[PDB]
Amino acid sequence: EEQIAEFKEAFSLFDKDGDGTITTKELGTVMRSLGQNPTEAELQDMINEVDADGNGTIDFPEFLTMMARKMKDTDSEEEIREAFRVFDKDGNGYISAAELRHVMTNLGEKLTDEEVDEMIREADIDGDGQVNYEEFVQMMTAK
Amino acid sequence: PQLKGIVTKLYSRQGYHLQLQADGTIDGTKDEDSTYTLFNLIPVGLRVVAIQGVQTKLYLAMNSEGYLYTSELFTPECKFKESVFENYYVTYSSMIYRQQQSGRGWYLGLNKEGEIMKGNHVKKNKPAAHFLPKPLKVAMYKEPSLHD
Amino acid sequence: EPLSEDDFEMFYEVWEKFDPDATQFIEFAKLSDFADALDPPLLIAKPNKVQLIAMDLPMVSGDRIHCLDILFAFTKRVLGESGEMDALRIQMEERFMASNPSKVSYEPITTTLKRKQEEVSAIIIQRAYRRYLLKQKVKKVS
Ligand SMILES: [Ca+2]
Ligand SMILES: [Ca+2]
Ligand SMILES: [Ca+2]
Ligand SMILES: [Ca+2]
């Protein structure tokens, strides 16, 4: 209701020329702005599943449905801490930055090097090579 | 369609794909798409499996002295007890041969250079024993002919 | 203190509640619930994923786990490893080979619980960090 303001910001970051519609190109530049490297197929997918009209582009309502599916916490647990404990071999609450990087680049929906590099800069605050994942999960769920 | 097995590759922790060749030699190769590395894994018993090279219709087996070999016929020496080690790798031991005193199994394994080791020398907790199957298809199988 | 016959019976009970058709298997995602559904000491209470990932739990494709593998693993958690455990394994494999005559549940191992779980929770972390970056970028424009 009162959130609408940020939405006008949000669309405005996707919509570069402000024509009220988001194209595969603008989507692309934003996904790349995050650190991803989407293919044209992947972008036509990100569009086609939230496309109501089938006009190939994304207007405000569709932008809403999409940003809704994206911002939604699927693992509504802030216990993704558990997920981190899965990789903490000795349970001391620290994962070696090397290990973390390897795991994140070689498993599941693998991260790009850009994403990963950022994640480690944010995660290894003192740069000692060990990463306190509890604090990182707190930072991540601060929203 | 009596026994529900799978058609797979077996990846060695030592860094090789397990390979059973036409001349009946067993070793490890770094050839990703060698057709000689596909295997029929056939459930012949409770957590027990037979491993057969597809292109050679040959069963892997282990004799009384621990030497790994291939057999065209299905002997009880072609039966392997499967079990995972540290919930991460799969190991295959003989169903009939062990230390007899200590009970430790004799396992299918490769050394660091991709050569096949003697059964009794392969310890379950060493990487030599460790495989991770990389499957291609599920598959049904005709329960094979037991001999001596 | 050891394990009474009662304990085994309760195991097979809730096992039936998770395996109505007696396929003798159970799905990857239902495992945690199953572990939660037991009486002590077999019981592994939630959260238990890191605890479950530590036991040898082979999975057959596609992401199914066999009953006896769970029995062995779960009883071993309690006892744990010994000579009495080996004899107990003999007994369990025998009792199972009794109350089950067929060979329908005999399928070869393709992975382990730990691998699948490592993939899944890796994914969880990824999607989380991604939503985080997006939130940060939307917040960026004020
Ligand atoms: Ca536009
Ligand atoms: Ca549209
Ligand atoms: Ca640690
Ligand atoms: Ca640190």
Contact B60, B70 (CB under 8 A): yes
| Whether C5 and C73 share a structural domain | yes
B21: domain CATH number is: 2.80.10.50
Residue A109 CB partners (closer than 8 Å, separation 6+): C123, C126, C127
Dihedral angle of Cα B120, B123, B126, B132, to the nearest 10 degrees: 80
State the distance between the two ends of chain B, measured CA to CA, in whole angstroms.
25
Count of structural domains within chain C:
2
Instruction: Give, for B5, the enclosing helix (H) or strand (E).
Output: strand B3-12
Record: contact B87-C114, CB cut-off 8 A: yes
Q: Is A104 on the interface with C (CB under 8 A)?
A: yes
Contact C110, B135 (CB under 8 A): yes
Record: contact B84-C97, CB cut-off 8 A: no
Residue C110 CB partners (closer than 8 Å, separation 6+): B6, B8, B133, B135, C59, C60, C61
| Whether C59 and C80 share a structural domain | yes
Q: Which of A34, A104, A110 sits opposite C134 (nearest CB)?
A: A34
Domain that holds residue B61: 1-148
Phi-psi region of B124 (alpha: psi -120 to 50; beta: other; left: phi over 0): alpha
Which of B83, C49, C58, B15 has its CA nearest to residue A87? C49
C42: domain CATH number is: 1.10.238.10
C133: domain CATH number is: 1.20.5.1190
Q: Which of B6, B46, B133 sits opposite C97 (nearest CB)?
A: B46
Cα C18 off chain centre by: 12
Which of A43, A48, A55, A39 has its CA nearest to residue A14? A43
| Whether C41 and C96 share a structural domain | yes
Contact A34, C94 (CB under 8 A): no
Report how far residue B89's alpha carbon sits from residue B87's, in angstroms, rounded to the nearest whole number: 6
Instruction: Give, for C69, the enclosing helix (H) or strand (E).
Output: helix C67-79
Q: Is the peptide bond before B114 cis (omega within 30 degrees of 0)?
A: no
Whether there are 3 or more C-beta pairs closer than 8 Å between B and A is no
Dihedral angle of Cα C42, C48, C54, C59, to the nearest 10 degrees: 90
| Whether C67 and C129 share a structural domain | no
Residue B5 CB partners (closer than 8 Å, separation 6+): B40, B41, B42, B43, B49, B138, B139, B140, B141, C107, C108
Nominal resolution in Å?
3.0
Contact C55, C73 (CB under 8 A): yes
| Whether C103 and C46 share a structural domain | yes
Record: contact A86-C126, CB cut-off 8 A: no
Residue C112 to chain A, least CA–CA distance (Å): 14
Domain that holds residue C66: 1-112
| Whether C140 and C105 share a structural domain | no
| Whether C48 and C88 share a structural domain | yes
Q: C73 in helix, strand or coil?
A: helix
Q: Give me the total of CB pairs closer than 8 Å, taking one residue from chain A and one from chain C.
A: 89
Adjacent-strand bridge partners of B60? B70
Residue B83 CB partners (closer than 8 Å, separation 6+): B47, B90, B91, B93, C56, C58, C109
| Whether C1 and C54 share a structural domain | yes
Q: Is A76 on the interface with C (CB under 8 A)?
A: no
For residue A63, the ligand closest to its alpha carbon is 2
**Residue B77 carries which side chain, given as an amino acid letter?**
E
Residue C79 CB partners (closer than 8 Å, separation 6+): C2, C3, C85, C88
| Whether C66 and C4 share a structural domain | yes
| Whether C73 and C139 share a structural domain | no
Which residues on chain B are in Cβ contact (under 8 Å) with C108? 5-6, 41-43, 49, 82, 133
Report how far residue C63's alpha carbon sits from residue C109's, in angstroms, rounded to the nearest whole number: 10
Which of B66, B76, B70 has its CA nearest to residue B118? B66
For residue A91, the ligand closest to its alpha carbon is 3
Burial (0-12, 13-18, 19+ Cβ within 10 Å), B60: buried
- The first and second tokens of residue B120, run together, are 């009794």
Count of structural domains within chain B:
1
State which approach was used to obtain the coordinates: X-ray
Report how far residue B78's alpha carbon sits from residue B58's, in angstroms, rounded to the nearest whole number: 10
| Whether C16 and C76 share a structural domain | yes
Sign of the CA dihedral A26, A31, A35, A40? negative
For residue A124, the ligand closest to its alpha carbon is 4
Which residues on chain A are in Cβ contact (under 8 Å) with C29? none
A2 CA to centre of ligand 2 in angstroms: 26
Q: How far is CA B148 from CA A19, B53, B97, B138, C68, in A?
A: 80, 20, 15, 29, 30
Adjacent-strand bridge partners of A22? A58
Residue A61 to chain C, least CA–CA distance (Å): 17
Which of A104, A142, A114 has its CA nearest to residue A31? A114
Q: Chains near A, with 3+ CB pairs < 8 A?
A: C
C-alpha angle B37-B40-B44 in degrees, rounded to nearest 5: 145
Record: contact A109-C127, CB cut-off 8 A: yes
**R_g of chain A computed on alpha carbons:** 18
Record: contact C134-A71, CB cut-off 8 A: yes
A99 CA to centre of ligand 4 in angstroms: 13
Contact C58, C112 (CB under 8 A): yes
DSSP codes joined into one string, chain A: --THHHHHHHHHHH-SS-SS-B-HHHHHHHHHHHT----HHHHHHHHHTT-SS-SSSB-HHHHHHHHHHHHS-SS--STTHHHHHTT-TT-SSEEEHHHHHHHHHHSSSPPPHHHHHHHHHHH-SS-SSEEEHHHHHHHHT--
Contact C56, B87 (CB under 8 A): yes
Which residues on chain B are in Cβ contact (under 8 Å) with C81? none
- The first and second tokens of residue C80, run together, are 């744990």
Q: Which of B49, B87, B132 sits opposite C108 (nearest CB)?
A: B49
Q: How far is CA A138 from CA A50, A122, A132, in A?
A: 31, 12, 11
Residue C76 to chain A, least CA–CA distance (Å): 21
